[model samples]
Target chain A: MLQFSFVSNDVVMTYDEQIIWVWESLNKFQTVCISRIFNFQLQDLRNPPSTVQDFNDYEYSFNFGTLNNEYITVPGRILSINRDVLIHKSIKLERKVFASERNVSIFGRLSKLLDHTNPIIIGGDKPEAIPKSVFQELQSKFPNTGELDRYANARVHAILAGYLDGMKDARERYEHYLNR
Target chain B: MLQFSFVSNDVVMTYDEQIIWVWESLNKFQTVCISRIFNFQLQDLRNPPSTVQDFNDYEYSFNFGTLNNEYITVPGRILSINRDVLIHKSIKLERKVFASERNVSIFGRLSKLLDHTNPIIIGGDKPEAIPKSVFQELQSKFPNTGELDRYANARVHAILAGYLDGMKDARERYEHYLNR
Candidate 1:
């Protein structure tokens, strides 16, 4: 009996958010399947690597599936995989920093507020670096501040660590196979 | 840098055992994805329905994607869905039951466990009636007994409740749409 809706004009939620939402929703629904869509931003090979090499980082693509399984693209980007965190941040901050440019409406501000609370920190000192003051500000604005903060911290660490570890293991396995 | 190998004449671990293994591995490695083959059993529809239908009342099939989503063929057969419990029980019981069975190999157990776990429970009871003696026996046999038990209980309850709730809602929505 809980309903959640994310509204955005220019910015889109990151693939991580989409993935988490879908994953959590699985236990909440009887049968859940996302429709294949075409709004996914494919990894542009021309761009320099930001996080890790050979990561095949794509942006704003609707990919959904189970872990260690093939996730098919859902229709209309069920989830946008935003590889470019800087772009995502700037677009996100634009509404917050300068609301007038987007003809800020009540809904817009509300949406912006929600985004501000859930800011996707791309390239920066980890979430731990966020000043207590800023953290406090976020807590005040969002319900269940402690829970949200803990979740955010845990999520970022998991994704970063998981990706790095997976890469390392995969590389080692590949070499071992070759040596054999 | 951690290696896990399941060796024994009876390789099968129960659903509970599987969950413990998953929880421990995930916690230890801080990894989300774990790879292992699963065995599922079809429900026995011939038996009269108790307060809730048995696992046999449902059918099983796989959908391809990034993750394999398990489907119960009999719509509305699932009174609820509890991922955590199902995962735990599936893992533990499969491991134990198969370990007690022939071949005594992890692969063999994995292949056989599926016979009892698939379409696991379509329309099952809320707050399942798992005997305390059986529960304790499982805990004593598995590592991280306390954590596994807590996790399994919560996960199972949540999954069962959620699945049933979802089915009910879906039926209602379908009716409304048809009426409109």
Candidate 2:
């Protein structure tokens, strides 16, 4: 979980193995990033979801109180990568935070805020979410790459996989919070 | 060694365990970052130099030859962290490239180009240089911190230390290149 001063109070964001949650206000929030890239057979899920397409759906827009609000939101078409070996998902927001008189607009120009080169989340104390596209390009030339490229590629895979395991633990607690 | 296209062709930069080399041109280069955080006992240095104070000196400004030059350089006083346990060093440049007619000025506003949280050097295929100040703050409350903070701090130390070893190898070849 990570907290940013996007509102009057710090808005907390979490990257559970299955979901990435972002806040709209101190009380309300939504998931902007999630992943189905996990081992379901040995894991908790007896059966994985039929399709992970629904994971791409955007959260319904909610009202923000009269005043200034700055935050991030999911795009209609979030960038994703689906491969035989790996399936990774994440969302992008404007490099600059969106601002408005009341609430931040549901949408704006979206570009990658998370850098593939930058693997750790500053102050967040977690490995950053690596883009699926980054992996896709590397996989195209997989087994036949340089030592450095191969090392980095393997390391990137390790980071995403490790985050998923930790994220899954948080997801269990997050699910409990939502149920209550 | 890493290559970036800030010129007609890719400008190669190298982060050998001992020095961080940046290219001013195809034929010209300078060391923007270096480290003295190694053990002299098992290693080959009879003495680690009188002091590493000379490491902070700026390179002579040189011509960039027309149009735009998007490169990074050291500040007048490069931000350094010198402590009992560690001495980590690096340089920063403007977020945006400076545009000039003849050459890039020797200096510009120096801010951290390298992030402590982000430990990988992207395409450079090396551990990013961890800031000394980061360790200093973490050391302030040493052994009395949370599990995550401790894990991250130790990992940061490992990354910087490992880079220093690799850097020393490259520094040897770099010196040979300069002498010839």
Candidate 3:
């Protein structure tokens, strides 16, 4: 498992919340990046990144220092409008988040939250079903402040719950797809 | 990329004639332990180390200090050899190397012998050749001792050359694989 740590200034987004959001977002993004854009571009160019290939050329270069840093080029032509749209939307979303003034310590907040015997449940039955004791413990450790908007919490909880449900559905669908 | 640094007693295996003799002798024993073996069995077990089911299982646990001792476990199940055989062979190899009385250094002695400027000709072409003058300059910086055996130089050269060739082969192979 590739473990990643991030430091951010968004107080509302806990580490688990950020991870859940990113994982769900990336899972959807991957379906398009890998299955659509990547496949189509490789097919058209007659080349692709693989276990072989000059690994350097296929490498993912992340610009970490500043927004002014150069964008790493993704070789070959992109074919799908859906992929292009998604990519553009993702960048916009990132910019929005980056501009937010919420001071968040994701890893520390998550670690502390997970330390609780029970954490507060924000969504429907599934989220609410988490042990009340654990929820209360987490709440006591990091009490919900006026800083965390009730509406935003509701929205995030719903989005997370939906994503989890979608994952279950996708797994079942994939099994059927493969067996069929 | 995340980088980790550790301080340990550095052991340099010089390419001197005596070291070459020891290396040859040690090769007969086969499979020496490079570093300490991590024993997962010593871990708390209640909270297992986060690891991939596949590759990570083989790595010595690095979490709990009690479990993270410097002992490299050579599992016979993976190697398909008895523990006695593994230990005996390792001990024998260690003795052979120790007899050479090699110096400890941060950098390996083998790296000094490299002819970086000479484009190591592969497939009768300089795929990514460095100038011969640069190679000579690099070679001068780390002047080879006449005491170093031909076999050791050849082995080092072979490893470097293989890396270069492998890159070229990988690029071509990926192109063909994706196209097909």
Candidate 4:
């Protein structure tokens, strides 16, 4: 069994350092949840998948779920909450800078080798619920980046009683994670 | 052993439905961490304290910690991150309202039994490290409230390289937690 620990929305890695995880704070509806990059999906399990593709199929699975209608959990590797750039550590690592210095919050340092761009899509739709075409386009640009289901319904119970239309406000709330 | 679970910032309760936990998002420096309310403090553990005072003394202990310079975790029953109202279920339940409804975010519903007020405190200092007089005043008004260290270092590592002076902005960012 693999052992890992996470608290709030900071970066954490497995004891082996073969896998790493990072997430945006602001735990709200469709707010960016934890994202991790690793070598195996279910290959190391006791009852592992027979085929490698079945083991790795999780890398391309659609990631989304609701917990007793209490929270909206969206899992995406290359997703943006308004302007908050939540890219997997494997995808890119932008230079960490203060919010005042830029329009959006960037975590960690920039890639001296390659410049990555995460275009923002404004709306209240969950990242995994977005149109497949859009998701595919994102996947085309960044391969091995998929919305895995492991983190589905990973958020705490959100108070969403008849307030579904205010997705814009919900998205705006995610800024707290970035501005910090 | 007592059983409970939490994910991000949202209200959660134990299996027995006796204890409840709540926290503000924007997990950062002194960013309001998890605060829980319960009938007993460490009294139900396997190796319980001999006396109730020793058991409940935790209700008056300090709460704060650093996770290997990766994160700053602060625990307080009565604390505010900018305007985000993060009161325990035992303290008060402010009426659930949108960010636009008021200057600060109010969760759940206000107590019809008694009106409640949670004033904001500025500065970047950790809530546990605040002056004793101020904390005492808070305790005097709200009995059974203490800064338990059980949640110490419960946060992810923060990126506090050298930028510790910009506490005001760090606080202003918490507004996102309220505005939403």
Candidate 5:
């Protein structure tokens, strides 16, 4: 039997060799993914099914909301080298509370949001999800959703730098593994 | 018969309908890519290969330097909206000039470098294969090649912003095609 999981609240990860092997296995897919990011575009899975797999060979999955409810399933190759190999590595990220039911697998958009610098504000911890009220208020402000995404994305600039430092380390490791 | 090409020198597009069909066909793949930009990571293809195919069925290819000597190939998905749906829209941007001998495909890193807003400007417009005299005049400048790459990458910022606008238009066009 194999076991692996990441704790969302703490932003923690726990996995055995089973997980490492799984991550290593993804090396090929990741190689294809990293390069193809030029060749392909990845969004969300429209019809994610509700099925669980053995941890050892589980195809990667994420749960932004409920497993089969409000959330969407995204790929591992998009987010971090670990969870995208897990599942998490960061310290001072500008974190906002999700509904508390976030799985180790967070949305790629969430991670993508963090990929910024320069506080959209003069200074802030980092960005977090705004309340539904804020989104509505923020709505009229953004010229369009694309600008909104870019604007909102910029908010997470601070800690994202650190978070990515770890991810970049892991990615370099993955590339090493590839070279090996 | 078929035709395909996008000119990077003047920030131009000159693809034939056959190329559009291929881009539209890759719509699904591009969708998967764009989102995973959350789930996926993109880097340049350091050693992209070249070949020819009927535009209707070309698997996609690139070139960067004098016909085929110095440059390498990268993916379209990496550069624009469809290259992210490079096939999307935009209006504002400032472009710079490159030697017209630019390969149809440029290296992903070059594209990746263009994907920036930050500046590590200790000095200069920035890094490039500077003349030997410039390098001799400036010694122990960049800590390493990495900084050099980032510095130069930032220089292309203006034109890239515009180039993406057209690419974004094309991407939106792709999404429209998908809707149809």
Candidate 6:
């Protein structure tokens, strides 16, 4: 079991330090879903495979489902709604900008160290599927960073939801362990 | 205990029948979230307590949030994206729809059925909160209708996350209950 005792050793992690803990935990399951759905392992994502483009403004489109869906395009370095950028919106810039001074959305700081490139492809002719090659590429990049903006929200929501039902028990246990 | 068995008393369900089951369960949690975060119980939204709105291209903005934020707005009938209708770009017309047609996002359908007009006032210069009267108006109208859309998505995602770590067990248990 992962020991979430907050400050380990004599040193402490910062705001993001705590955030990373949850981020990685959530990724593990998301990774599980990807792996189960697409025949790939999390390890493959450590290195970028020899393929692809649209890293910034390209915003890779996945036919996962919902018949031609768009990725959560994080405009500039800040992960915000399509409306926030004030007109000329482009993805020409993509990089690690964790805990930035630029935006207010949590995805702002989150995008610094993580990737929000892909999320579950929703609605398309091939709604419930991800192409083999594209799946291959996303899988490799997924472990560290994948469909971050939504996952970021997911991670946060999962945390919020954890405070209820049986989750309340797990949260209490974790809280007890952390403060101990 | 809530019966997880499909077809309670032989009521035929949707093809996404199993999905609907999950949808309702997740709504229970979301309902918990709503009840805790917002005021006026689900019971409160059943009837119109008197309110107002402007349909068509008119986009009504609510200051609902942890102080500063906006909405995903699901308009009526079609509940398409506000921008969808313009170029027949559909999601452009996604706005100003207001009520019914479904909750594109949870707030959408939720906007229709329940009076989304009232939510908990977290923090603001004047953010004391929605009054009992207004809150009363929104709740009774909230049930059965609203954002069957994203909340349907919400329920599904909640189920997905349940499969790993603490959530995994709950998911497993739910699955077991479903098939039985």
Candidate lDDT scores, in order, read: 0.29, 0.26, 0.27, 0.25, 0.28, 0.26
lDDT of 2 by residue, A1-180 (tens): 221222342222222222212222211432232222111111212122333334334232221111212223222232231211111212222211221111211111012222223222111112343243432332232222243233333433343344445656988989987955
Query: How high is the TM-score of chain A in model 3?
Result: 0.17
C-alpha DockQ of every model = 0.01, 0.01, 0.01, 0.04, 0.03, 0.01
Candidate 5 chain B: minimum summed lDDT over ten consecutive residues — where?
B94-103
Candidate number of the best lDDT: 1
TM-score of each predicted structure versus truth: 0.17, 0.15, 0.14, 0.17, 0.20, 0.16
Model 3: lDDT of residue B15: 18
Model 4 TM-score?
0.17
Worst 10 residues of 2 chain A by lDDT: A101-110
User: Best candidate per DockQ, number?
Assistant: 4
- lDDT score of residue A179 within candidate 3: 58
Fnat (0 to 1) per candidate: 0.00, 0.00, 0.00, 0.00, 0.00, 0.00
Please give, for residues B15-131, the per-residue lDDT of candidate 6 as tens digits.
111223222433465221121112222222222122342222222111111111222221122222222111111112111222212211322323233323443231123343323
Instruction: Give the per-residue lDDT of model 4 (tens digit) for A93-163.
Output: 22121111212122221111113344322123446232435323322332111211111111101222212
- The segments of candidate 2 whose C-alpha lies over 4 angstroms from its true place after superposition are A1-148, A177-180, B1-180
Candidate 4 residue A129 Cα shift, in angstroms, is: 29
Q: For candidate 1, what is the DockQ-based docking class?
A: incorrect
- After superposing candidate 1 on the true structure, give the runs of residues whose Cα lies further than 4 Å from its correct spot: A1-9, A13-136, A139-180, B1-8, B12-180
10 residues in a row with least lDDT, candidate 6 chain A: A59-68
Tens digits of per-residue lDDT for model 5 on A45-141?
A: 2222233545544433322211112222223343432222121122122121110111121222233333443211211222432233432332233
Over 4 Å off, model 6? A1-146, A163-180, B1-118, B124-180
Model 3 ranges off by over 4 Å: A1-32, A35-39, A43-79, A82-152, A156-180, B1-55, B58-180
TM-score of candidate 1 relative to the true fold: 0.17
